[PDB]
Amino acid sequence: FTSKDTYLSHFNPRDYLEKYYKFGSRHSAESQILKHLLKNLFKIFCLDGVKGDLLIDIGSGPTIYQLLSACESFKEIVVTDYSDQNLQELEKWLKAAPAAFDWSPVVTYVCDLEGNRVKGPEKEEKLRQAVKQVLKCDVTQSQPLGAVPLPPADCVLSTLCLDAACPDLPTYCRALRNLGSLLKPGGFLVIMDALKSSYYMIGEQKFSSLPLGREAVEAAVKEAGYTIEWFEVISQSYSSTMANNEGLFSLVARKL
Ligand SMILES: Nc1ncnc2c1ncn2[C@@H]1O[C@H](CSCC[C@H](N)C(=O)O)[C@@H](O)[C@H]1O
Ligand SMILES: CN1Cc2cccc3c2N(CC3)C1=N
């Protein structure tokens, strides 16, 4: 199973962004999936009452898509990833470097969902202002953020990280439990991940994925000290050239 070190040495941020996050007019398997992610995080952060002071984004990677709706609902967003190269691609965009991956097609989409109330530039600035901290992360450590002092967060968020980072269920259950120590009692856990997947490709590079189904995930969540507000499962898959998932699940949980 892909080790931590192989995320430091082989995970290619720009490569990954190109492969998965170039909102393309040709209706790819990747595009449709992004569209669906975007719609859930909208429903969760805008339509529903999931809001608060502090959100912690677990396993951010180089990507900002999952923070776009959340920035409407939280004052303070911290972003975390295990890999230094990854945090460096984020910061590019945070700094609005002209070398930063181009997100406007995604920003366009979200602004639409929220009924065009704002424009790309004013959506972007909101996120920029919202992100206070960019930190090293390890979901396997009982203190994932290590030393860094943080108040208890209202919400922990994780998109397609926990599958990537957890070799087994024991460890997967440990990770959730670790995230929970950053969360208030009654705090929000929002996870979105692949169902029944063993690998995913960034270019030529193959990264492991923990193949778990609907049941195992829900079980792991209860064990870690959470109750599930809601749990969703969609058929849509990635291109066969890229991963072997059967679908995706989204959930909102609450800590005890
Ligand atoms: N032990 C660990 N702790 C924290 N993050 C880890 C980790 N092992 C891997 N990761 C991170 O998990 C991410 C999986 S890729 C998903 C990135 C982003 N959330 C998205 O939706 O596309 C990578 O950025 C990798 O650095
Ligand atoms: C964006 N993808 C696509 C994907 C598909 C399947 C499995 C996994 C992924 N992961 C992590 C695990 C990603 N980061």
Author numbering: 5 to 260
From the primary publication:
Nicotinamide N-methyltransferase (NNMT) is a metabolic regulator that catalyzes the methylation of nicotinamide (Nam) using the co-factor S-adenosyl-L-methionine to form 1-methyl-nicotinamide (MNA). The nicotinamide binding pocket of NNMT is an attractive target for small molecule inhibitors. Here we describe a novel series of tricyclic compounds that are potent and selective substrate-analog inhibitors of NNMT.
JBSNF-000028 inhibited the human NNMT (hNNMT), monkey NNMT (mkNNMT), and mouse NNMT (mNNMT) enzymatic activities with IC50 values of 0.033 µM, 0.19 µM and 0.21 µM, respectively. Both the compounds were found to be tightly bound to human NNMT in presence of SAH (molar ratio of enzyme:SAH:compound ~ 1:5:10) with ~ 10 °C shift in melting temperature (Tm) whereas ~ 3 °C shift in Tm was noticed in the presence of SAM. Based on these results, crystallization was carried out with the hNNMT protein in the presence of JBSNF-000028 or JBSNF-000107 and SAH at molar ratio of enzyme:SAH:compound ~ 1:5:10. The asymmetric unit contained four identical copies of human NNMT molecules (named A, B, C and D) and overlaid within 0.4 Å RMSD among each chain. In the active site, demethylated cofactor, SAH is bound in the cradle formed by loops (141Cys-Asp-Val-Thr, 85Asp-Tyr-Ser, 63Gly-Ser-Gly, 163Thr-Leu-Cys, 69Tyr-Glu) originating from the Central domain. Tricyclic compound (JBSNF-000028 (Compound 6) or JBSNF-000107 (Compound 8)) is planar in nature and bound below hairpin structural motif at the nicotinamide pocket and stacks between Tyr-204 (from Hairpin) and Leu-164 (from central domain). NH-group attached to saturated 6-membered ring interacts with side chain of Tyr-20 (from N-terminal helix), main chain carbonyl of Leu-164 and very proximal (~ 3.2 Å) to S-atom of SAH. The overlay with hit compounds A or B shows that compound A lacks the hydrogen bond interactions with both the sidechain of Tyr-20 and the backbone carbonyl oxygen of Leu-164 whereas compound B does not form an H-bond to Tyr-20. This could explain the lower potencies compared to JBSNF-000028 or JBSNF-000107.
